[PDB]
Paper text:
Functional and biophysical studies demonstrate that these domains interact with the intestinal protease trypsin, suggesting a role in clustering proteolytic activity to the site of peptide transport in eukaryotic cells.
The phases were calculated from seleno-L-methionine incorporated protein using the SAD method in space group P3221. A higher-resolution structure in space group P41212 was obtained using the P3221 crystals as seeds with a single monomer in the asymmetric unit. The final structure refined to a resolution of 2.06 Å with final Rwork and Rfree of 19.9% and 24.0%, respectively. Guinier analysis of the scattering data in PRIMUS (Petoukhov et al., 2007) shows that PepT2ECD has a larger radius of gyration (Rg) compared with PepT1ECD, 23.1 versus 18.4 Å, which suggests an increase in particle size. Consistent with this analysis, 3D envelopes of the ECD generated using DAMMIF show that PepT1ECD forms a compact shape ∼48 Å in length whereas PepT2ECD is more elongated, approximately 61 Å in length.
Author numbering:
A (entry chain A), B (entry chain A): 408 to 587, 593 to 601
Write the structure that this text describes.
Amino acid sequence: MAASQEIFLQVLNLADGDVKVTVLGSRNNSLLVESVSSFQNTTHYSKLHLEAKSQDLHFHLKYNSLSVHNDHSVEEKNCYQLLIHQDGESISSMLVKDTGIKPANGMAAIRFINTLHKDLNISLDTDAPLSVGKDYGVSAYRTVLRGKYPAVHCETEDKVFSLDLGQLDFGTTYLFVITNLQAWKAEDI
Amino acid sequence: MAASQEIFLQVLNLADGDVKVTVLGSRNNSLLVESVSSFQNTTHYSKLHLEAKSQDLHFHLKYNSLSVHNDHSVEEKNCYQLLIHQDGESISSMLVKDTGIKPANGMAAIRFINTLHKDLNISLDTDAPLSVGKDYGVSAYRTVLRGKYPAVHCETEDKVFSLDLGQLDFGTTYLFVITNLQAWKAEDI
Ligand SMILES: [Cs+]
Ligand SMILES: [Cs+]
Ligand SMILES: [Cs+]
Ligand SMILES: [Cs+]
């Protein structure tokens, strides 16, 4: 996907309003300048130039009258998703690295981010548990058949919950952010 | 790059102001909703979902008090650049398909779009002419060494012109739009 000293970035805004984003390198140099709407970007990506094979990037985010500074390390030739979320009376971000594995024909791949205060089990297969840790825990990737998943079985941990995933397309990898079960759907590059 | 019934799109705005873009499918269905600044997007891309392996997409563009409608055909698993340009007292767009060839280590790849009213020869190699037809003609791709090209030899067709390309990075493919020689630099996904 990305060339030497380059990365791909997808910005995911889970805040209740627009978020202004900049990403700086080591010398007050903007690698990305982006305005992101609430519950965007599901299918928009940017290419960032690094100064080395590895770097700590400076993510500056404006939300209302706040301008936060969050640092996250990256490695060349990788794709990342920056998840922006409301953190108390402020905002914070988490950076997740995406997989380079292409689903087999007839399959799609899915992953979860759990924002709730309780650990979740996504029960797609009963002989293959899919754990999603509380407070922004990230699940392992899982390959599934392409198709519609309107009522997926979800446990926490003596409680049962249903989750709608919508239509999953052939050869596509999805990220589901569990918000309330309710989940926001984004697509990996 | 893109999965079955998907494309990548990069929007290149050569107009003097912001351009609002929508791209529709066959049933008043938005595949992309984008606001693009003047001389952007050099490194931002979107994924579009097609309804078939091939489709004619409806590109709607707003520039000041104009809302134009331009149709361009696409094929699945391809990457495209939409070049928006001022066309008299209006705007128009052209869609170009990008190559899937990765430059060898130590190399970069480049391509030209000539907006001038005269045919151009980009003389990088004297034994390998690089023609760029007038009135938005597209040149063939050319692999070159990574490095700085501040004064490239450019002919039209008994006249000599110099062109600055800046720094070309390892493994990257570039699009140069010749505007006035003066050229705007964009990067293929
Ligand atoms: Cs975008
Ligand atoms: Cs920092
Ligand atoms: Cs963007
Ligand atoms: Cs149309």
